[PDB]
Design a protein around this motif. Structure first.
Motif, PDB file in Angstrom:
ATOM      1  N   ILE A 124      51.492  28.684  50.093  1.00  0.00           N
ATOM      2  CA  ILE A 124      51.958  30.018  50.456  1.00  0.00           C
ATOM      3  C   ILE A 124      51.048  31.094  49.880  1.00  0.00           C
ATOM      4  CG2 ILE A 124      53.518  30.225  48.493  1.00  0.00           C
ATOM      5  CD1 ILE A 124      53.976  31.516  52.113  1.00  0.00           C
ATOM      6  N   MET A 125      50.353  30.793  48.780  1.00  0.00           N
ATOM      7  CA  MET A 125      49.473  31.784  48.168  1.00  0.00           C
ATOM      8  C   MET A 125      48.322  32.155  49.094  1.00  0.00           C
ATOM      9  SD  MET A 125      49.866  29.572  44.826  1.00  0.00           S
ATOM     10  CE  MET A 125      50.951  28.482  45.742  1.00  0.00           C
ATOM     11  N   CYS A 126      47.716  31.161  49.750  1.00  0.00           N
ATOM     12  CA  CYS A 126      46.628  31.448  50.680  1.00  0.00           C
ATOM     13  C   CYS A 126      47.123  32.204  51.906  1.00  0.00           C
ATOM     14  CB  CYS A 126      45.936  30.153  51.102  1.00  0.00           C
ATOM     15  SG  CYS A 126      45.288  29.171  49.736  1.00  0.00           S
ATOM     16  N   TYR A 127      48.345  31.913  52.358  1.00  0.00           N
ATOM     17  CA  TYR A 127      48.921  32.648  53.478  1.00  0.00           C
ATOM     18  C   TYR A 127      49.146  34.111  53.122  1.00  0.00           C
ATOM     19  CZ  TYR A 127      49.729  28.653  56.546  1.00  0.00           C
ATOM     20  OH  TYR A 127      49.566  27.577  57.389  1.00  0.00           O
ATOM     21  N   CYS A 128      49.629  34.379  51.907  1.00  0.00           N
ATOM     22  CA  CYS A 128      49.868  35.756  51.493  1.00  0.00           C
ATOM     23  C   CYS A 128      48.568  36.524  51.309  1.00  0.00           C
ATOM     24  CB  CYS A 128      50.691  35.780  50.205  1.00  0.00           C
ATOM     25  SG  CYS A 128      52.389  35.203  50.404  1.00  0.00           S
ATOM     26  N   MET A 129      47.483  35.835  50.956  1.00  0.00           N
ATOM     27  CA  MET A 129      46.193  36.508  50.855  1.00  0.00           C
ATOM     28  C   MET A 129      45.655  36.888  52.228  1.00  0.00           C
ATOM     29  SD  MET A 129      45.014  33.964  47.889  1.00  0.00           S
ATOM     30  CE  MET A 129      46.145  33.915  46.500  1.00  0.00           C
ATOM     31  N   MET A 130      45.970  36.098  53.256  1.00  0.00           N
ATOM     32  CA  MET A 130      45.543  36.439  54.609  1.00  0.00           C
ATOM     33  C   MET A 130      46.250  37.686  55.117  1.00  0.00           C
ATOM     34  SD  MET A 130      43.110  35.093  55.243  1.00  0.00           S
ATOM     35  CE  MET A 130      42.092  33.746  54.688  1.00  0.00           C
ATOM     36  N   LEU A 131      47.534  37.836  54.791  1.00  0.00           N
ATOM     37  CA  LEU A 131      48.248  39.045  55.182  1.00  0.00           C
ATOM     38  C   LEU A 131      47.676  40.276  54.493  1.00  0.00           C
ATOM     39  CD1 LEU A 131      51.717  37.397  54.755  1.00  0.00           C
ATOM     40  CD2 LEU A 131      50.551  37.807  56.911  1.00  0.00           C
ATOM     41  N   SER A 132      47.152  40.113  53.276  1.00  0.00           N
ATOM     42  CA  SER A 132      46.545  41.240  52.576  1.00  0.00           C
ATOM     43  C   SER A 132      45.277  41.707  53.278  1.00  0.00           C
ATOM     44  CB  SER A 132      46.242  40.857  51.127  1.00  0.00           C
ATOM     45  OG  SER A 132      47.433  40.680  50.382  1.00  0.00           O
ATOM     46  N   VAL A 133      44.361  40.779  53.566  1.00  0.00           N
ATOM     47  CA  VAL A 133      43.084  41.166  54.157  1.00  0.00           C
ATOM     48  C   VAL A 133      43.278  41.682  55.577  1.00  0.00           C
ATOM     49  CG1 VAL A 133      42.458  38.908  55.099  1.00  0.00           C
ATOM     50  CG2 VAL A 133      40.669  40.487  54.332  1.00  0.00           C
ATOM     51  N   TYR A 134      44.292  41.186  56.287  1.00  0.00           N
ATOM     52  CA  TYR A 134      44.607  41.743  57.596  1.00  0.00           C
ATOM     53  C   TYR A 134      45.330  43.077  57.472  1.00  0.00           C
ATOM     54  CZ  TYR A 134      43.304  37.212  59.511  1.00  0.00           C
ATOM     55  OH  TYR A 134      42.616  36.077  59.866  1.00  0.00           O
TER      56      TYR A 134
ATOM     57  N   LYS B  56      45.023  45.136  54.920  1.00  0.00           N
ATOM     58  CA  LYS B  56      44.120  46.131  54.351  1.00  0.00           C
ATOM     59  C   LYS B  56      43.296  46.806  55.438  1.00  0.00           C
ATOM     60  CE  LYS B  56      42.537  43.598  50.723  1.00  0.00           C
ATOM     61  NZ  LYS B  56      41.664  43.335  49.547  1.00  0.00           N
ATOM     62  N   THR B  57      42.854  46.041  56.432  1.00  0.00           N
ATOM     63  CA  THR B  57      42.083  46.566  57.549  1.00  0.00           C
ATOM     64  C   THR B  57      42.958  46.998  58.719  1.00  0.00           C
ATOM     65  OG1 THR B  57      41.739  44.297  58.316  1.00  0.00           O
ATOM     66  CG2 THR B  57      40.026  45.282  56.943  1.00  0.00           C
ATOM     67  N   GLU B  58      44.282  46.989  58.548  1.00  0.00           N
ATOM     68  CA  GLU B  58      45.227  47.413  59.581  1.00  0.00           C
ATOM     69  C   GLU B  58      45.129  46.546  60.834  1.00  0.00           C
ATOM     70  OE1 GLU B  58      47.433  50.204  59.234  1.00  0.00           O
ATOM     71  OE2 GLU B  58      46.289  51.903  58.448  1.00  0.00           O
ATOM     72  N   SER B  59      44.711  45.291  60.672  1.00  0.00           N
ATOM     73  CA  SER B  59      44.588  44.362  61.795  1.00  0.00           C
ATOM     74  C   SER B  59      45.972  43.796  62.098  1.00  0.00           C
ATOM     75  CB  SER B  59      43.586  43.259  61.478  1.00  0.00           C
ATOM     76  OG  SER B  59      42.324  43.800  61.135  1.00  0.00           O
ATOM     77  N   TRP B  60      46.792  44.621  62.752  1.00  0.00           N
ATOM     78  CA  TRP B  60      48.171  44.236  63.031  1.00  0.00           C
ATOM     79  C   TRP B  60      48.270  43.071  64.005  1.00  0.00           C
ATOM     80  CZ3 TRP B  60      50.601  45.921  59.234  1.00  0.00           C
ATOM     81  CH2 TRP B  60      50.440  47.220  58.739  1.00  0.00           C
ATOM     82  N   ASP B  61      47.215  42.799  64.775  1.00  0.00           N
ATOM     83  CA  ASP B  61      47.246  41.658  65.684  1.00  0.00           C
ATOM     84  C   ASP B  61      47.241  40.346  64.913  1.00  0.00           C
ATOM     85  OD1 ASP B  61      46.210  43.989  67.350  1.00  0.00           O
ATOM     86  OD2 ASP B  61      46.377  42.435  68.891  1.00  0.00           O
TER      87      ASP B  61
ATOM     88  N   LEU C   8      52.148  37.556  46.674  1.00  0.00           N
ATOM     89  CA  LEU C   8      53.252  38.047  47.491  1.00  0.00           C
ATOM     90  C   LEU C   8      53.326  39.569  47.470  1.00  0.00           C
ATOM     91  CD1 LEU C   8      55.501  37.203  49.298  1.00  0.00           C
ATOM     92  CD2 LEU C   8      57.021  37.104  47.313  1.00  0.00           C
ATOM     93  N   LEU C   9      53.198  40.169  46.285  1.00  0.00           N
ATOM     94  CA  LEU C   9      53.237  41.622  46.189  1.00  0.00           C
ATOM     95  C   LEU C   9      52.016  42.259  46.837  1.00  0.00           C
ATOM     96  CD1 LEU C   9      54.473  41.717  42.519  1.00  0.00           C
ATOM     97  CD2 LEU C   9      55.808  42.326  44.526  1.00  0.00           C
ATOM     98  N   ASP C  10      50.863  41.591  46.771  1.00  0.00           N
ATOM     99  CA  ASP C  10      49.680  42.091  47.461  1.00  0.00           C
ATOM    100  C   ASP C  10      49.893  42.113  48.970  1.00  0.00           C
ATOM    101  OD1 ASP C  10      47.243  43.276  47.185  1.00  0.00           O
ATOM    102  OD2 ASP C  10      46.104  41.421  46.935  1.00  0.00           O
ATOM    103  N   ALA C  11      50.497  41.056  49.517  1.00  0.00           N
ATOM    104  CA  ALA C  11      50.764  41.018  50.950  1.00  0.00           C
ATOM    105  C   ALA C  11      51.763  42.095  51.353  1.00  0.00           C
ATOM    106  CB  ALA C  11      51.269  39.634  51.353  1.00  0.00           C
ATOM    107  N   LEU C  12      52.861  42.225  50.604  1.00  0.00           N
ATOM    108  CA  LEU C  12      53.890  43.190  50.974  1.00  0.00           C
ATOM    109  C   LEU C  12      53.357  44.617  50.935  1.00  0.00           C
ATOM    110  CD1 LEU C  12      57.172  41.875  49.298  1.00  0.00           C
ATOM    111  CD2 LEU C  12      56.443  41.678  51.674  1.00  0.00           C
ATOM    112  N   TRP C  13      52.586  44.958  49.899  1.00  0.00           N
ATOM    113  CA  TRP C  13      52.115  46.332  49.760  1.00  0.00           C
ATOM    114  C   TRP C  13      51.165  46.718  50.886  1.00  0.00           C
ATOM    115  CZ3 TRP C  13      53.597  50.335  46.790  1.00  0.00           C
ATOM    116  CH2 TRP C  13      52.769  51.462  46.776  1.00  0.00           C
ATOM    117  N   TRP C  14      50.236  45.829  51.244  1.00  0.00           N
ATOM    118  CA  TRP C  14      49.292  46.145  52.307  1.00  0.00           C
ATOM    119  C   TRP C  14      49.937  46.109  53.685  1.00  0.00           C
ATOM    120  CZ3 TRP C  14      45.911  48.796  50.256  1.00  0.00           C
ATOM    121  CH2 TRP C  14      45.222  48.431  49.095  1.00  0.00           C
ATOM    122  N   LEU C  15      51.084  45.453  53.827  1.00  0.00           N
ATOM    123  CA  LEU C  15      51.810  45.422  55.089  1.00  0.00           C
ATOM    124  C   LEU C  15      52.819  46.553  55.215  1.00  0.00           C
ATOM    125  CD1 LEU C  15      52.386  41.634  55.835  1.00  0.00           C
ATOM    126  CD2 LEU C  15      50.509  43.168  56.452  1.00  0.00           C
ATOM    127  N   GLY C  16      52.884  47.447  54.233  1.00  0.00           N
ATOM    128  CA  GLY C  16      53.787  48.575  54.281  1.00  0.00           C
ATOM    129  C   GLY C  16      55.176  48.307  53.756  1.00  0.00           C
TER     130      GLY C  16
END
Lengths: 199, 594
Positions: free
Chosen positions: B379-389, B391-396, B456-464
């Motif tokens: 799950i850690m690698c999945y949450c890092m992917m949500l961050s990098v997406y 961060k760049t606003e790649s909502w797709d 997890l907190l990195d993913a949530l914050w960058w996803l709004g």
């Protein structure tokens, strides 16, 4: 050092020294971590408050641990800080630890004569006369000259306990230092010689 | 024994014994020990039965070797239940069997994994009227512990405690190990607290077992009391025992007390092992203290210790948290030159580097190769992917990856965590399932927990989902994660973010700032200082700390939230402070879900 740093150190050291005197080693630990949070570096006098707080609550292990923290932080312990640990070691009868700390003071280039005197009186006061004699003779044979009051203390206490061998060793060292024995010291040795059955 | 070792047939030894009996000299159990030995060699079940039945008619008490040979010969054929019948037959014959026979029978059953059979054997012991011994209880606890029946070992431990049979030390070592492996670290210390009242002297195995539980779970206070207890009993702790204490301090970010224990190891002669140099490296890696990590590395080379893979992972993690992105990838670049074998964490270690420095295309190449070998990334690698997406606003790409976690028929943790990110589980009853996963993950200790919550907190914050990140952080603190995060006394109000990710740091500051304005509204006094600890190490006494990415991020975050109220310190590079006078001239941060 800026004015802001000096103002914070005063109020941080006000709180720290008010808990060392309160015999609260736990509180003295909290303030040090408060200093670390503020970025202030704990100096030799901040760890002195930690040693003293443990020492005042008869805690030899915590006080020794506090000294390890001070050395591990790169700070140089104050001569008073070592004396607090040496006096504490004597109160528990730990002559080996008291001698280890005296060796450290020499390594730190301090003057161990005063701390050696304190170690011997603590052992005598806490009924560790056998340990006190071992520490006293090592200092006396090492070249240190004891106080006249401590000389009269060691001779008298040994002769009250029937230890003529130690009382004669000390009185020989007392004269080698330059303090000649008087009627008082001879009367102490005679108190034991008169009971040996050989007039 | 000449014939048995020589390879003679079985009937020869039996026929040879028949000659012993006819000679008029009273036979011995030794031959019947042999008569049951070669049966065990050749797997004869019935033959051993008639041999044992003859001795029961012979009126001689069997010894331990008779029962051991019977157990061996029947378990080779998998007919251990017949041994119970052999014991039951002798129970009615007036010859009461010894507990040594029953313990051996339980031991083979424990090896075979039979739980019900062991239960039936234990009941058959009780009906015989004999009191079970300490070795009996130790067998069941290890047997029940191996099968994950932790409630059963708790009941059986209580049963023997109430059976007027004072448990031995080796019982507690089994209890300590099973609870320690299960994540019941507070129970491990509770076991010691009970065990010291029953006037039972611990040993080296007990001390190392408890300290490992404290180190894994990050209970530094309990670990310190173990060391003091050992010293107070004139016991010199082993080199492994100190390494557990060093581990616990690094879990709580108490580097000063950790390095004291490291220093004390050489004082007592318990020189550090290879594992000790790893407890420090992982402790320093979390805080980004690559200056201290290089000290260990420069010490490992001259200590004769080659660089293994675990050392390389800590180096990448330390450089990443310290903001040295270029040196992090160089270590991964230099790692492959020296062969070795990158593990799953190494891929996760280098993925966090690329995710932190907003490398969308590089992260994609790192991610699909993780599943290219059928590894099912955690799950850690999945949450890092949500961050990098995010961060760049790649909502797709965010929605594409979330649907992958929504089904996830194999792994439950991804499904619950993926569902709760979208906000489906934000209800009173629907937050219990999320908490259920958190408690399950709260068993590998604080070391894994800090990694999970940082991602997890990195993913949530960058996803709004900034309000959700606030409640997730509130869930971590009550579980012991980030114990150094907050201090609130009369002197200092501090927040320590040197072990957090950028998203976690922003969440920590946001909550801290909102709580700061609360005490300003009311008359709750005021701290002499409000500080933000962004760099916590030797880097503070330098100009590089103020140039750290974390220090710049916190200051930039604070600049456009409280105007110019938090200024740097002239005495420390890694502090951002606010005087008490300036605290008077101060929600401050909006926490909303996109």
């Amino acid at each position: 050092v800026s004015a802001l740093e000096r103002s914070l150190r005063l109020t941080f050291m006000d709180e720290l020294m008010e808990r060392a005197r309160n015999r609260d080693p736990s509180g003295v630990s909290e303030v040090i971590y408060d200093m670390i949070a503020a970025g202030l570096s704990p100096g030799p006098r901040s760890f002195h408050g930690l040693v003293v707080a443990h020492a005042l609550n008869g805690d030899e292990q915590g006080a020794m641990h506090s000294l390890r923290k001070e050395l591990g932080a790169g700070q140089r312990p104050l001569p008073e800080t070592m004396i607090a640990l040496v006096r504490l070691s004597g109160s528990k009868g730990n002559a080996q630890r008291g001698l280890e700390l005296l060796a450290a003071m020499e390594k730190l280039n301090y003057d161990i004569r005063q701390a050696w005197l304190i170690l011997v009186e603590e052992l005598v006061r806490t009924n560790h006369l056998e340990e006190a004699n071992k520490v006293f003779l090592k200092g006396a044979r090492g070249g240190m000259r004891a106080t006249d009051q401590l000389y009269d203390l060691m001779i008298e206490e040994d002769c009250k306990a029937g230890d003529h061998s130690n009382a004669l060793d000390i009185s020989y060292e007392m004269e080698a230092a330059g303090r000649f024995a008087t009627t008082f010291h001879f009367n102490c040795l005679l108190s034991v010689q008169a009971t040996c059955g050989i007039p | 024994n000449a014939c048995a070792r020589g390879g003679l047939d079985w009937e020869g030894l039996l026929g040879l014994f028949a000659e012993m009996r006819h000679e008029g000299i009273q036979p011995d159990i030794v031959t019947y020990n042999t008569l049951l030995s070669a049966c065990a060699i050749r797997g004869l079940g019935d033959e051993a039965e008639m041999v044992f039945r003859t001795m029961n008619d012979g009126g001689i008490v069997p010894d331990l070797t008779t029962y051991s040979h019977l157990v061996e010969t029947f378990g080779k054929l998998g007919r251990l239940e017949k041994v119970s019948d052999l014991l039951s037959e002798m129970a009615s014959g007036g010859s009461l069997p010894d507990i040594t026979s029953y313990n051996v029978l339980l031991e083979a059953y424990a090896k075979s994994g039979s739980i019900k059979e062991a239960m039936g054997v234990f009941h058959q012991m009780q009906a015989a009227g004999c009191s079970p011994n300490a070795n009996t209880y130790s067998v069941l606890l290890n047997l029940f512990g191996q099968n994950g029946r932790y409630d059963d070992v708790r009941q059986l431990f209580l049963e023997m405690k109430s059976s007027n049979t004072d448990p031995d030390a080796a019982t507690y070592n089994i209890l300590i190990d099973v609870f320690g492996e299960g994540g019941y670290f507070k129970e491990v210390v509770t076991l010691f607290h009970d065990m010291v009242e029953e006037n039972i002297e611990p040993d080296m195995e007990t001390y190392e077992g408890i300290i490992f539980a404290c180190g894994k779970g990050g209970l530094h206070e309990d670990a310190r009391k173990i060391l003091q207890y050992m010293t107070a009993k004139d016991v010199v702790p082993s080199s492994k025992a100190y390494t557990g204490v060093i581990e616990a301090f690094g879990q709580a970010a108490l580097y000063e007390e950790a390095l004291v224990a490291f220093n004390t190891m050489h004082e007592v002669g318990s020189n550090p092992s290879i594992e000790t140099f790893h407890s420090l490296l992982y402790s320093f890696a979390r805080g980004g203290l690559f200056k201290e990590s290089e000290v260990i590395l420069s010490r490992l080379v001259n200590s004769g210790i080659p660089r293994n893979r675990d050392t390389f992972n800590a180096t990448i993690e330390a450089y990443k948290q310290g903001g040295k992105f270029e040196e992090a990838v160089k270590t991964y670049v230099d790692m492959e030159k020296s062969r070795c074998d990158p593990d799953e964490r190494t891929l996760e270690a280098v993925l966090s580097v690329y995710s932190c420095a907003r490398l969308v295309d590089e992260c994609r190449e790192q991610f699909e190769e993780m599943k290219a070998s059928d590894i099912l990334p955690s799950i850690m690698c999945y949450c890092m992917m949500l961050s990098v997406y995010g961060k760049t606003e790649s909502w797709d790409d965010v929605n594409e990856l979330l649907e992958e976690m929504l089904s996830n028929r194999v792994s439950n943790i991804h499904q619950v965590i993926g569902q709760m990110i979208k906000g489906n589980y934000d209800d009173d009853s629907n937050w219990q399932i999320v908490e259920y996963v958190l408690d399950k993950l709260n068993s590998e200790g604080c070391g894994l927990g800090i990694r999970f919550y940082n991602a997890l907190l990195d993913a949530l914050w960058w996803l709004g989902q900034k309000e959700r990140a606030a409640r997730v952080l509130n869930e971590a603190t009550k579980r012991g994660i980030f114990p150094e995060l907050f201090r609130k006394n009369k002197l200092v109000w501090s927040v320590d973010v040197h072990r957090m990710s950028e998203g976690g740091m922003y969440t920590a500051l946001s909550v801290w700032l909102n709580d700061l304005s609360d005490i300003l509204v009311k008359g709750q006094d005021l701290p002499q200082l409000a500080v933000v600890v962004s760099v916590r190490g030797q880097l503070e006494k330098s100009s590089a700390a103020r140039e750290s990415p974390i220090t710049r991020a916190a200051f930039s975050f604070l600049q456009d939230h409280v105007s110019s109220s938090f200024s740097f310190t002239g005495w420390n590079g890694g502090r951002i402070m606010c005087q008490r006078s300036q605290l008077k001239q101060l929600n401050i941060v909006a926490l909303t879900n996109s």
